[PDB]
Design a protein around this motif. Structure first.
Motif, PDB file in Angstrom:
ATOM      1  N   UNK B  76       0.828  -1.163   0.000  1.00  0.00           N
ATOM      2  CA  UNK B  76       0.000   0.000   0.000  1.00  0.00           C
ATOM      3  C   UNK B  76       0.872   1.226   0.000  1.00  0.00           C
ATOM      4  N   UNK B  77       1.943   1.224   0.794  1.00  0.00           N
ATOM      5  CA  UNK B  77       2.918   2.344   0.739  1.00  0.00           C
ATOM      6  C   UNK B  77       3.774   2.420  -0.539  1.00  0.00           C
ATOM      7  N   UNK B  83      -7.755   5.778  -0.066  1.00  0.00           N
ATOM      8  CA  UNK B  83      -9.130   5.272  -0.044  1.00  0.00           C
ATOM      9  C   UNK B  83     -10.065   6.404   0.390  1.00  0.00           C
ATOM     10  N   UNK B  84     -11.313   6.407  -0.098  1.00  0.00           N
ATOM     11  CA  UNK B  84     -12.257   7.464   0.285  1.00  0.00           C
ATOM     12  C   UNK B  84     -12.667   7.312   1.754  1.00  0.00           C
ATOM     13  N   UNK B  90      -7.944   9.040   2.699  1.00  0.00           N
ATOM     14  CA  UNK B  90      -6.761   8.685   3.455  1.00  0.00           C
ATOM     15  C   UNK B  90      -5.780   8.049   2.487  1.00  0.00           C
ATOM     16  N   UNK B  91      -4.500   8.105   2.842  1.00  0.00           N
ATOM     17  CA  UNK B  91      -3.362   7.632   2.044  1.00  0.00           C
ATOM     18  C   UNK B  91      -2.599   6.643   2.922  1.00  0.00           C
ATOM     19  N   UNK B  92      -1.953   5.658   2.281  1.00  0.00           N
ATOM     20  CA  UNK B  92      -0.992   4.780   2.965  1.00  0.00           C
ATOM     21  C   UNK B  92       0.093   5.582   3.700  1.00  0.00           C
ATOM     22  N   UNK B  93       0.468   5.124   4.897  1.00  0.00           N
ATOM     23  CA  UNK B  93       1.672   5.633   5.551  1.00  0.00           C
ATOM     24  C   UNK B  93       2.313   4.619   6.499  1.00  0.00           C
TER      25      UNK B  93
END
Ligand SMILES: [Cl-]
Ligand SMILES: [Cl-]
Ligand SMILES: [Cl-]
Ligand SMILES: [Cl-]
Lengths: 511, 511, 511, 511
Positions: B76-77, B83-84, B90-93
């Motif tokens: 994912x990173x 994702x909504x 939100x974003x991968x971290x």
């Protein structure tokens, strides 16, 4: 059984201790290709007077919850008073004093196969609160026995035992300028210095200090504000930006000169040090300058007793762990005279600011978590609820963002016996001040004291005032290691015991 | 823009960095008149390979909540998946990774008038979790996509995006000895190595490791246990007190030899390092000895993800503040496969012990507070509640005695997204291990690696295993300063920046 | 100033009050086209003796926390004892007694423009706890003064004031069968009836009751169990399914016959009523039958004092509001002798069952919310934590599903001074029993008492035992309206004041 | 399968149902010797139209969180929309609607051996929210799709499914008088009726209502305020004490005439009923009088959705149990547009008053507990915290005095998805109003509707407005039994099933 140093870098002569410390500091340079870090060493030569001086403490608000408790508990510990409880007995103690009960890690001892932890007070000699002589002032003339009944801190039994000690104590009359505190305090003020001439007031308190110093033959006098939160004064040139400005404003009877300004001035002019336990901005630049000029220490602002002491250690722990605080909400309710005073808006501002301020240096510490350095939503409430009295109730919600946009929510409920939290801190502030009054270091072949604005007191304070042009440090455990490294450096035995590499390596022979 | 060292004590040659560090250690002597403290210095000479090696990670329990999430989030990173949400996107971290997101304090810079905080990963070069190649084993043959649906950690959208990456991944079959975990796991076990000969099992996993190392041409192989909590084995001579004992017990098909023992053995014998993320006592003395003999690192035990990470920092803060913990009660409920496994008594013991253990070194640190060194009432509960699933709920009560027999009570509620807490810690354990695999120091004219039992991993672990004859260290922030001082010492720029005395003194000219 | 009834349906004669009540009951019929509801009326004719009888109460576990407190507080209220607090004074009272302090709504009075609320005790005459004469038994011979020091409920001062009343009281020796309670109670048991013949034991307690009844010339004797939670007995025909079975098992010295069975039997055989304040299954079918046959009332099981009293009202409120409880988790810790007993597994079962049982009738009430009538995840923990002592700590999490698959989560912390919660309930159970002993109604031209199993006591009890073949009712406020409607019906003035339609209509002329 | 009544007191003719109910009411007389209670009976004759009328609902603040959600969820339930979750699927429903999901207790059925609970909506025929046609007004022109994105209530997926239904809906322009709400709403107001003539405004909304009623051929029109909390108007004769006063003030363009006054007036004048969901004092005496004169129902004030709904049931339960609330502290934080509006002081007052008001009738109910009828310390906080958004956080502390001056402290944390709590209540208010519009009763040979101020809506409201000269009723469960007894009385089958005496007596033969 004392704690005895063995070092080529330490010398006792004349009851002072000389101590050479090599300070490791990084120096920086920003270049096109990145950040260049140059580690350098700075030899400090400390002298520490080893015998604590005879010490008087003068409290403003002597008859308050903190004041009467501070006094009560000293007596109570001197005589080892006990009181019956449902559980058996309780005895007087000094818990929650860093100086009286923190221990410090010097390292590991192979013979006993043990981590070595010593009492803070064993490292360099410091006062016990039993050695403090205490007077002060109060706008209320109630004696310290009626003052205990008012405060509702000690159990009845212990107030009776303390009666023949506290009852004779009636605080001196104080300066009362109605406009600097909650208008709800008018009724209570029956012990005030006559007149509206602020310079006569200045002189009256000066007079109060000298006689105290004379009457008990004191070598260290500390004045400490633990009366009601005043509002903020204005700050501007003409009024209080310089020492000469602040002195002149008192002479010409200026309005934006607080009762707490006059005490700070009376203290400095008499060679007494001054601590501000409340949120107001007493230590304006003019005041600091006046302390610098008179070779006295100042401290503040605002006891860090409960919800903020926790906040301080928890937000540090969370940012260190790689976690983004997103939302911090801090409710508080109490029913003591402190709360009834913070019912009013200008006084609640004093306190709101100092409670809200403690996560700034941490959000700036981490630009991965906080790329834009924007503080999280941060809300601070204080409410006056008579019923809980001195038993303040801290209700907090912390919401953090963690791995992959997940969330972690901590909800907290904290029963803070404010007076029982605050007093020990009054003993610590006084005690670290007298100690600092005993330390000097080599500037250029002559020995000098630390800066007047003694920031090492920060662990005890919410809104630390610090030498001009230097950063505020809010994270409690970090403030504690400043203090414990300093006293070990003074005593001759600082170390790298935060990284005990002996345990996973073979330890090189000593050099 | 890198971080560049400027020192007479540091030399680059051949892509390794040599770094001389002078270690400050106190040495003690007990005498009739008291404690004598002798500060001495120990020059360490470090070498650190600067290029991280090509690194494979093998997880036992690859198909679990932690496993499938650990894998999912790397992908994912790598692809920066979003994702909504109701709030936006939100974003991968990699939040909640110490290595990827902690910053470190090197000091203060006058030019910028600023505290200098750098990312941990900028100090000595370390892996990013994006650089980790991951396989492993699971008694369940479900592919890592079905495994995500099982776990209920990622929001649906993110599981769909991750589908073409995770779906092809089906874990290798594992060793299953029904008697070492919760009997409720029988249904799930459809991917097991045939037979009851434990030496054939040993050989089968050895075979698994070599091929992984071959097939991706890896220079560092780490094996890590994140499968279900096993019960404890017996410990005794004859069985597993020595290396030769443990090897023999496997040969003669002994009963008290766990699946987790066989993995640890298969790992060491193949030059892979081994981390234990669970409570069981895998690293018995025989195992440590086997790791010592084979020049491999071991680590454990038990991720310190949530309620215990907090406990760790909070009990330290409270004893440092001069406060006596009297009562610690820790409830927990969760509904994931981890909880369903800890439904059973012998497995709950594994975990109870490791959760209960973290306030020992602190109670021993302070004999004013704890004259008789008696731990406070300390109660640890875990309950299986299907409904909350992966969202574990930590409910805690801390009761302390403070000043004058007063009490302070903290009640706490902590929403712990366990998998989201745990995975980043899996990335940190792997990452600090590969780094340690790159460090050596001078013993006697030849360079040596650290001890096999790599205790510097303690900040990540509840029940840290440590080199024989040395003390356990449980207080998190203390474990963090061990780590950050070490990497600064490696990189060339350690300091006394926990006591920035420049701010209240005039800084002596550099030597 | 009494409360005086004005009705054509009420007649005083001979110090009893006759009261005709027309009961509105729906009758049902299920048909193809749906549910047919036929409202019918049932004239009850009540007689209520108006003078409360002279009443003795015998407690098993007289020397426990509840027992010694129950006794202490009666004395304390008789003499109006006060004790000093930090706040001033506290005085004895009977708060938390429904009978002594609940008020009841009779309606609205136009003249005073007021809702009319009267004390429960003003409706039909009932005892005051001051009128109760109390003895009983304890396996510990400690007198009720040492018993107070043990319990740690009353503040020291109040134990001293109560000393000359409580100290002379030493409980009678009791039946001790080690196998029915926590093995940790062995040390405490120094006041036991000799021998292992259970029929001699039966006779010994019978002897104890008659003499108590004689020695104080009592007209109502109530026996009440407030000793340690026993485990459950087996239940089966041959042993205790019928009265004759239970009598025979005592004669032949059967093993599965508890100490609490023998008290229940000794009570019934002597015409004393019997209340079970603990979780054990004392009131097996054989016992109920024996009470039916001997014209005595039974009650139980298990005080509903704290976390369950709340649970009871909150789950009702939530299902009535159209909300689906999904998850109920209830942690508890305490340090009293009650907790030390519930350390052991078979005793904790007794209690777990009765705590877990209170949301059954509510989940069955609503098939929109619960289509499949499946109870939510429901977890009940009790832990022995010495430090908190009698101050039990109830920590709960309720998770509900609300509108559109949204969630609502309530987290709760509840400080339960168990003994202070429990005792008033001991006064209420006794008091409602003596009252019921004064009520009769027309069956068929002769007057009859209520059923022996007096379920109207349910509001006080966690796990209510109810007349065979009738439903359990768990929701507290519902249990309270049963009680308050009943006493208003007895007194002559029941109403529809739960729907005061006068306020939004014009009130029709009276008929 | 319907629910079918069998009674000599019920008659269907012409699709209305006639229902004779005999009401039991106590009547009082105060005399020297005490309180005389005379039970009397009052025959009510009800008629209930059985077919629900075609019903339009007009919301003020149609584009808000509540408004757009109220609309969204109707559509969502009409089409049975589902959305993916980590757990599986969620589906549209109407949980948290009393009318759609409460069940009611009619009694016990011997054949099935069962308590009989029926859905509220089965008793007398009522609307489903699917049958409501909805329009309304908003100062913001955003369509109901952008409105959903704004609100952040529905998960993204569900907003997409709802897009083709909500997107076409753009609210009508409204009255905007900047001075009646938080000045922070200026930016949002781009959809306003031109001019400052309030009578033209009055006429414009009248015009809006008639066309809505025409365009959908509605037989019942309800107008409901769910726009931002306005401040209070002044109340005085000359302005708004009478109907003719309020009409005149609108004609002469008076200042203290709110936007919410004009809607209430436009509603009444058009024969639409009017509900006030907010704290402001819209329903001044002049308005009630105008509703009385125009034969329309009014309701309010202020949704009772979360912390107050609980407070309502919990303080009742505690006073009924014989417990004295001493201290009630209620903190709240939220980040929606509701919170941003309550940032400002005059708007926060509206709400503070209505939240603080709910323990008055209970403290007056019990003069043993409250001899002097003095309310406990009661503190209500609301804070604007953007981060939590619609997820309001209610943090409460209840402190009670119990038996013998003991204390019981409940600490509570309550996650309130405000919009998800509020909307169902919007459906209930509308629904009970249309139902009341169908009920009449015999006054004097002609049939009359209930009073205009329909207090039976109280269970849904914080600060219930009630027919002049009658008492406010705040305790939720009490408000629910008013409602459920009423509909059973309408339907023909009310009972005494709160006291099922059949279970402990032999049931007399029916009369
Ligand atoms: Cl001490
Ligand atoms: Cl990141
Ligand atoms: Cl009372
Ligand atoms: Cl539904």
């Amino acid at each position: 059984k004392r704690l005895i140093v063995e070092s080529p870098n330490v010398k006792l002569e004349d009851g002072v201790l000389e101590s050479r410390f090599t300070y490791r500091k990084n120096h920086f340079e920003h270049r096109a290709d990145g950040l260049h870090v140059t580690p350098k060493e700075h030899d400090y030569s400390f002298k520490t007077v080893l015998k604590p001086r005879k010490t008087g403490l003068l409290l403003v608000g002597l008859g308050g919850n903190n004041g009467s408790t501070a006094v009560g508990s000293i007596f109570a510990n001197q005589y080892a008073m006990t009181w019956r409880t449902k559980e058996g007995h309780s005895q007087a103690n000094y818990f929650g004093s860093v100086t009286q009960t923190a221990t410090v890690h010097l390292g590991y001892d192979s013979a006993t196969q043990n981590q070595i932890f010593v009492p803070f007070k064993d490292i360099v000699p410091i006062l016990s609160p039993n050695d403090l002589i205490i007077s002060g002032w109060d706008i209320s003339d109630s004696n310290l026995y009626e003052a205990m009944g008012r405060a509702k801190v000690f159990e009845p039994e212990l107030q009776e035992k303390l009666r023949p000690f506290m009852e004779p104590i009636v605080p001196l009359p104080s300066i009362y300028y109605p406009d600097f505190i909650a208008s709800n305090q008018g009724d209570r003020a029956n012990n005030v210095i006559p007149g509206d001439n602020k310079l006569e007031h200045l002189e009256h308190i000066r007079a109060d200090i000298r006689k105290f110093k004379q009457e008990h033959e004191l070598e260290c006098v500390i004045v400490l504000w633990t009366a009601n939160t005043e509002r903020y004064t204005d700050v501007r040139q003409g009024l209080n930006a310089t020492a000469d400005e602040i002195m002149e404003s008192i002479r010409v009877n200026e309005d934006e000169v607080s009762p707490s300004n006059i005490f700070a001035v009376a203290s400095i002019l008499e060679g007494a040090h001054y601590i501000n336990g409340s949120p107001q901005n007493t230590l304006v630049p003019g005041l600091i300058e006046l302390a610098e000029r008179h070779k006295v220490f100042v401290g503040g602002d605002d006891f860090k007793s409960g919800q903020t002491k926790f906040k301080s250690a928890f937000v540090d722990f969370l940012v260190s762990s790689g976690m983004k605080p997103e939302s911090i909400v801090s409710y508080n309710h109490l029913g003591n005279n402190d709360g009834k005073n913070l019912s009013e808006a200008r006084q609640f501002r004093s306190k709101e600011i100092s409670k809200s301020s403690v996560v700034d240096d941490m959000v700036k510490s981490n630009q991965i978590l906080f790329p834009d350095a924007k503080n999280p939503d941060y809300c601070v409430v204080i409410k006056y609820v008579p019923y809980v009295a001195d038993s303040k109730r801290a209700m907090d919600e912390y919401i953090c963002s963690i791995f992959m946009g997940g969330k972690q929510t901590f909800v907290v409920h904290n029963t803070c016996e404010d007076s029982l939290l605050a007093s020990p801190l009054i003993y610590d502030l006084a005690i670290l001040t007298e100690l600092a009054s005993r330390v000097s270091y080599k500037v250029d072949d002559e020995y000098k004291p630390f800066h007047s604005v003694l920031s090492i007191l920060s662990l005890l304070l919410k809104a630390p005032v610090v030498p001009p042009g230097t950063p505020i440090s809010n994270a409690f455990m970090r403030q504690f290691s400043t203090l414990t490294k300093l006293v070990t450096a003074l005593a001759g035995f600082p170390s790298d015991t935060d990284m005990q590499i002996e345990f996973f390596t073979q330890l090189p022979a000593a050099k």
